[PDB]
Amino acid sequence: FGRFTERAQKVLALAQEEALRLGHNNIGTEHILLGLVREGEGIAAKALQALGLGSEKIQKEVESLIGRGQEMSQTIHYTPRAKKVIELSMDEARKLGHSYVGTEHILLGLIREGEGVAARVLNNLGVSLNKARQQVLQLLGSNETGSSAAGTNSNANTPTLDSLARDLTAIAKEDSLDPVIGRSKEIQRVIEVLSRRTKNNPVLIGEPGVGKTAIAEGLAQQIINNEVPEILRDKRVMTLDMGTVVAGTKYRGEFEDRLKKVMDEIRQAGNIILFIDALHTLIGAGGAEGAIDASNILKPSLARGELQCIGATTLDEYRKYIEKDAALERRFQPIQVDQPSVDESIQILQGLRDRYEAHHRVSITDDAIEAAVKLSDRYISDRFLPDKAIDLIDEAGSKVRLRSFTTPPNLKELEQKLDEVRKEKDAAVQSQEFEKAASLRDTEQRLREQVEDTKKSWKEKQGQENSEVTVDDIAMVVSSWTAQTETDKLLNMENILHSRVIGQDEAVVAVAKAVRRARAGLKDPKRPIGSFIFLGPTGVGKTELARALAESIFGDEESMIRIDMSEYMEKHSTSRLVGSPPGYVGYDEGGQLTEKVRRKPYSVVLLDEIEKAHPDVFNILLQVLEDGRLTDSKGRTVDFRNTILIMTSNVGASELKRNKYVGFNVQDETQNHKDMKDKVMGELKRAFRPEFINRIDEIIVFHSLEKKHLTEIVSLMSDQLTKRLKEQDLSIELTDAAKAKVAEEGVDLEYGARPLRRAIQKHVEDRLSEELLRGNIHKGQHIVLDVEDGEFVVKTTA
Amino acid sequence: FGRFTERAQKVLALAQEEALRLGHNNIGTEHILLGLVREGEGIAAKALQALGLGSEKIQKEVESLIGRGQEMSQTIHYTPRAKKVIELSMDEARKLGHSYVGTEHILLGLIREGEGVAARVLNNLGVSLNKARQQVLQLLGSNETGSSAAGTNSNANTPTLDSLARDLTAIAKEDSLDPVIGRSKEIQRVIEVLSRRTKNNPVLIGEPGVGKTAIAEGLAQQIINNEVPEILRDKRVMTLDMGTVVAGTKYRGEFEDRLKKVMDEIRQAGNIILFIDALHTLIGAGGAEGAIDASNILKPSLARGELQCIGATTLDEYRKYIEKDAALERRFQPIQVDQPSVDESIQILQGLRDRYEAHHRVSITDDAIEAAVKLSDRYISDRFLPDKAIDLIDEAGSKVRLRSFTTPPNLKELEQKLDEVRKEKDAAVQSQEFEKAASLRDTEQRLREQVEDTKKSWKEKQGQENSEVTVDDIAMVVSSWTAQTETDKLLNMENILHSRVIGQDEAVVAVAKAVRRARAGLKDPKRPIGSFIFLGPTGVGKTELARALAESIFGDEESMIRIDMSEYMEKHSTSRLVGSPPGYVGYDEGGQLTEKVRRKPYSVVLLDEIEKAHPDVFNILLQVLEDGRLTDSKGRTVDFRNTILIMTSNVGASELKRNKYVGFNVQDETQNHKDMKDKVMGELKRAFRPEFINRIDEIIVFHSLEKKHLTEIVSLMSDQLTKRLKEQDLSIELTDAAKAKVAEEGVDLEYGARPLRRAIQKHVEDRLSEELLRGNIHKGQHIVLDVEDGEFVVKTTA
């Protein structure tokens, strides 16, 4: 394990001491027991001293069970009995929440292993084994502090507090207080809104997702002394805990009955504070599938102030309360809880370190915690600023902890061997062939010590991680799903985007710089990390950059939404997607676009071919580009604050699909180039209204379909083929030469660049399969596809 | 606390005196105990006197504790123990109602403090700790208020009043029933309509939400004493509560059975009055899901005149029940319950001043109450004109009480210091470094008393508040939502509307004066408190004033609806803007327009382009402006009663969106102006149909792009950028000079003033992120964006 208390460790070594002192050169449980009592009067030792066992009494018994002498100090270590007692003790401290293991637990574990020599020692010296395990437990368990005693009060409190529930005020007078770090400025604003008797109900709106609950412990403190008014003193804060309500309930009627009981006791009115977390569920308002309607009792209660309560709500929730104005608006009144500022994130992260140090990585590295924050606003980008954060931390706060125990130095070969020994040995004795197992046995246990010696030399991988979450690591984990390898991803985004988009350097650099500015963790998420228009017609490199943006920008290929503007005109998907004349935009705003981005807020959102849609759609979208939010889909709020908005457009097609070739000269090629590098940048404005486009962070231009583009199309198709074949376990690569023979059947002037897929099928798929079937090449072998002197040739390598 | 009775206080001071008299210059609880009994025969004192203890007996133990000497004082104050006894008594009086703590509670609090100097004195002088708390409980005094009674009897009346649900008359025969302030004129209207034995059912219709419930106590008082019909003499008034019915029930079948029992009990018939609040739920008729249908039993009960009852329903509720008929018709007959208005408001406030003087804030300030009302009407706006009001007083009626208990004068620094002391001291002794903690220890308590002395200088913040809710406070609290900084918001409304609409003063003053006059409670509170038409082009000042109106009239810009009337005739979009529009005028009345304002009555409702709308829509808008309410959309009533209805126009647009050119003059922007401050007053007649438009309270005038508005548009856009960045905690400001560098890229003759957003991104957004990235500027540093040499310049400021 690692991380134990003194008393424990001390009890353990004393066994070995007695090993030799009593002649039992192997420390069985008799010596562990002895160890407990030989630590004198520690919790183990002391326990044994209660039941009637001196250090003396044990070692003599111990000595009477393996005899004396048989010593020579022949490698006096534990044996498996003694090892069992230890395995148990660790859990006997885990049980008590200890991330350490002390004396008590060692006797507790000893008892657990209540057969073997220890067991016989205690049962011979007039001590019942469980009487001993009792005794240790009831002295001390886990080590902790923060406690106080003396004091009682109140009578009226009786009916309420039984039910349902713990009283927040209590635990902070018990010296079990936790701050909890908010979101401090929120707490002050509650008491104006609370110590009323007319609209006395606060309602906190933020995100889930801010750690709302942090603000709440604030209240506790102020409710005691003295901020709340003079005869509004003697306030108590009772939380209406959902967990207690569901407990003992198994029906809708029963759930209502529990709420009724709370309401009946609520007669403590106007001087009682009820805390309702996630307020919406009880009101049941809004939606097409509302929640249980507590609202009938709650509405007059809220208005009366008998239910003088505090509501904890989020981004979306509020709409469904102001709709039932005013008795949840003659009660309600709002106060601002953050869309978390970066700094608030950091302190939460730091706070939860020691328990990811139970996953034993984090605590630390500092920059890496910071990485969780800084990286989260732009890179994942999938929740709210602290939820995101902590995930980056702990993922990496385990990732390396996984990398930890993979090998000894490289002495993984030792373990492999030690296995092989057993086999030889075993089967040889199974014939017997006594000594024909023997030397193999001897070789085995030799091996074993080497194995274990260099695997606990890979305690260096513990000291590596067991306080470190790595900079690069936190970032790496953020890159993995969807500091260093996110900020290297950020800084070098352009480098990453160039390796997957061939041509359209114009486009790449434009996205790169706009995203990288935002993406440096220096732009608030409340607008896409990049808004963009991706110009050129379909087939010019637009989408491919969006994809490449997911890889570079997000650190993995994952997360890309994609919405068609052409459907929001009912004439390109009015009969390819279900609906009628009064549909299509209602599907997009009302459902598709907003729902999709709620799943991954990260996503490169591609609202394609924006010319086709009328400009009116663009106004709706415009709110996405500016605000970073839309509220649609039954009042849900979708964070496009983390998205990259990419609007593609119907731009310039004729040149921007024109190929090089010789049209008049060998300078018709260099006139497809210069011409395409002109044609995007004037065609863009014609493909849309300006109102959409200005709220876009750089206007990305993608140019033509050169000749030159043909051999780039072959290299897009062949790579998609060979990769879907990788799941089989085929490792394939195409040389440029092999893409050339494929081009031989697709330099058609009359059928374009379409035949290339078919010719890839013929020359790659079909050819690889015709080489695998013959056993010329194999799966797992790396397969190079080349053309030799004009004819394609398939070669194999490792 | 703030309130205690003599006996309590007397017990307390006597403790200190006896402390030192016996040689204890620290007043232990041992002296508090002594104190209790040294106050002779008060309930604490008496209690101890029962158990066999005199003040003498206590002091003897006390002298056997510290004893002589310690009569040299210590500036004798309490012990931490003694401070505990006081905190406990407070709760020991709360639990017995009392928030004006008496003697009993002090001995009770001693018991509570069941370990300590007292505790052991009392447990040493041979009396149980609990025998003492008993004795105090079993005699009360200073927990009552004086009421009447001298005997109790009943007859046939027994089964009914038991059940379910208590009678107003009983508590008013003890003469402890409240008036209530009301809604007094409402009570009168009942007595023809109720003292029938036929259609004897009054049915109160108002806002809920106005204090309808006030009227009910009205009846109680007048049916008892003393001049009323012989009809209403020989009657009983019984209140029926929904809460009791639901209690002990969790199914519909059980609820009906209980209701059957009630119906049987109506056998007090033709002389019994049943009060049913929220009457509608029981009849169960109408709706899309109705409610539980008591009506089968209840309907003949009303017809027979056995059930003579009082119905409490709201604006909207009634229609689908008189729709049932005709014993419903021969039951009900209507009476007017207060529709929210300013004069009525004030009277409620004043009435509940003294009762929110439980908050030692409000009662009063007079100006503050009036303000609460007047301010509420304009600044949220959402609720009802008197509910809003009382909430501000009580809101504020804690708000300054918060500012109370957080001051030392500026000696907040003391507390900070006193902490630091402990640290030094503590850590030093932990090394020990005994006297190296000592002097630090001594320095601590020097500080401490000084600290505490200046924390109790903030009894001056009590003397501020304990009957004065602060005028300014009410305003602050309304500003918290959305007199002084709301009536300065009101008075200076014009100034406030002017500051966000630059130019177009013509418009500003027109809106300003009409609302600012009106909202002082001097214009109809059942019609939009300003109606306006906003003419101009599309945009340019129109909407922007509506926003500025929200701020000035309502307190923040977040008080602005905005609905397009052209959708309520729709013939443009159906799949690119809005989902399912057909039915169109029906869509607005029947649903959408009304629903939106029903969400927020706290809004400048801006109904755009009623000019380009079906003629029915203008009629619909006309109802909003006249009635102030519309009842549609499931028979719900939408209060436009504290909205500002603003109907927009843009049929003169071209001149009103014209731009300056030279031609012959550089006074061409100021000749684009002169044309436009004319062009609106001609766009009115051309736009609309007359029947609607004339209800408008002023014709609001706007302008164009000119040369001149353009450079004002750059300053609107740059502010949208910097503000969404504030959320992360970037403090940004642009000087005019940086907005100038941006303008450099968007004063095109042929690409509009649309490029300005994009160029704001390049020169502001992009620039801030590229200045944060190199560490020149920072979050929470105020960041000035300038030009100072014809090129951009980065400054830092606090």
Side-chain angles (χ1 to χ4, degrees), chain A residues 85 92 110 240 250 406 428 503 659 704 716 737:
Chain A
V85 162
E92 291 287 73
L110 189 103
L240 301 190
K250 60 186 68 59
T406 52
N659 292 251
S704 87
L716 181 58

Side-chain angles (χ1 to χ4, degrees), chain A residues 289-324 326-327 333-383 385-435 437-451:
Chain A
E289 188 178 1
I292 187 63
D293 193 72
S295 197
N296 303 118
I297 52 170
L298 268 57
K299 283 286 187 292
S301 299
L302 281 167
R304 281 177 292 192
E306 63 169 51
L307 176 60
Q308 168 176 76
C309 65
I310 301 179
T313 67
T314 61
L315 68 174
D316 49 285
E317 292 182 56
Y318 205 80
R319 200 279 304 194
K320 301 170 289 298
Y321 306 121
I322 194 60
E323 176 161 63
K324 296 180 176 175
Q333 181 276 340
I335 65 173
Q336 196 277 338
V337 186
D338 301 67
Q339 180 301 115
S341 307
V342 283
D343 39 89
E344 309 183 305
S345 309
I346 313 172
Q347 50 80 8
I348 302 293
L349 307 200
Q350 295 283 344
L352 301 164
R353 278 182 167 189
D354 199 57
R355 203 63 202 147
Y356 308 157
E357 201 79 287
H359 293 320
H360 291 279
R361 273 238 65 204
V362 225
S363 314
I364 95 176
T365 35
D366 295 293
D367 180 54
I369 263 59
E370 222 294 294
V373 183
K374 177 184 65 276
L375 301 179
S376 277
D377 67 82
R378 25 83 170 218
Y379 282 88
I380 300 192
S381 280
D382 274 300
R383 309 96 213 180
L385 243 300
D387 315 302
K388 294 164 183 194
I390 64 172
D391 308 325
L392 318 188
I393 318 171
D394 223 349
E395 214 270 71
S398 38
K399 164 167 281 176
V400 198
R401 240 303 197 274
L402 170 56
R403 301 192 304 217
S404 197
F405 302 119
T406 52
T407 52
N410 293 110
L411 297 170
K412 178 69 270 181
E413 183 51 60
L414 300 181
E415 290 83 283
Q416 296 167 239
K417 295 185 291 82
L418 177 66
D419 306 315
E420 302 168 60
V421 199
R422 283 271 48 254
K423 185 186 79 283
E424 307 149 10
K425 172 191 169 175
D426 200 277
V429 264
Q430 232 72 354
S431 310
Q432 49 169 27
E433 267 200 295
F434 315 98
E435 200 282 309
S439 188
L440 318 178
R441 181 274 175 192
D442 309 321
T443 57
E444 193 178 305
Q445 209 290 125
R446 280 188 285 269
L447 230 158
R448 191 253 80 201
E449 300 167 296
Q450 310 159 21
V451 164

Side-chain angles (χ1 to χ4, degrees), chain A residues 493 497 507-518 527-535 545-546 549 553 604-607 610 625 643-649 688 692-693 695-702, chain B residues 758 761:
Chain A
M493 65 180 56
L497 288 153
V508 176
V509 176
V511 298
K513 289 165 65 280
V515 190
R516 171 184 293 110
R517 287 175 308 213
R527 190 193 72 86
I529 316 298
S531 287
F532 291 120
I533 10 172
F534 278 14
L535 307 163
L545 190 58
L549 278 168
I553 301 312
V604 266
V605 182
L606 285 71
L607 286 139
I610 69 190
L625 278 51
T643 60
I644 294 198
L645 268 277
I646 290 172
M647 273 52 76
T648 79
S649 305
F688 32 76
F692 202 5
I693 75 100
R695 290 57 162 186
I696 273 166
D697 193 7
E698 300 194 65
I699 292 180
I700 318 303
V701 285
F702 298 76
Chain B
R758 181 72 281 270
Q761 296 187 267

